[PDB]
């Protein structure tokens, strides 16, 4: 059950960010993965996302929910390094919370604290 960091080496990830930032300078590179213990949400179709740098976290969350085709009654949370602010621009989350490899990592679940 290998996560993205386990499938690609640290060097491969650093190199991937460098090139994708050079080719897509208006986009934030984001890794979005499902919580390993998740039991009721579907898995996403892909792992690596490019998010425009005028978008905020509230907007991203609604977009991902829609990708998963969730019913209104279904809980969804998006965690950036374990913390569950919706208004923050994804550029600012990136500057603050990006990994040493340069990706911004997120995990989604139907629980908010996990776990």
């Amino acid at each position: 059950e290998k996560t993205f960091k386990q499938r690609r080496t640290f060097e491969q990830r650093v190199e991937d960010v460098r090139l994708i930032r050079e080719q897509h300078p208006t986009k934030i590179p984001v890794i979005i993965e499902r919580y390993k213990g998740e039991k009721q949400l579907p898995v996403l179709d892909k792992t690596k996302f490019l998010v425009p740098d005028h978008v905020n976290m509230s907007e991203l969350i609604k977009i991902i929910r829609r990708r998963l085709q969730l019913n209104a009654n279904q809980a969804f949370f998006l965690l950036v390094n374990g913390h569950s602010s919706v208004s923050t621009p994804i550029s600012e989350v990136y500057e603050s919370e990006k990994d040493e490899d340069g990706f911004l990592y997120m995990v989604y679940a139907s629980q908010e604290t996990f776990g």
């Binding site: 993205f4 892909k46 792992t47 996302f49 998010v51 907007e59």
Partner: peptide
Amino acid sequence: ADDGHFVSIELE
């Protein structure tokens, strides 16, 4: 997994 492609997210 398709680690070789990025989804390009845009506002609707």
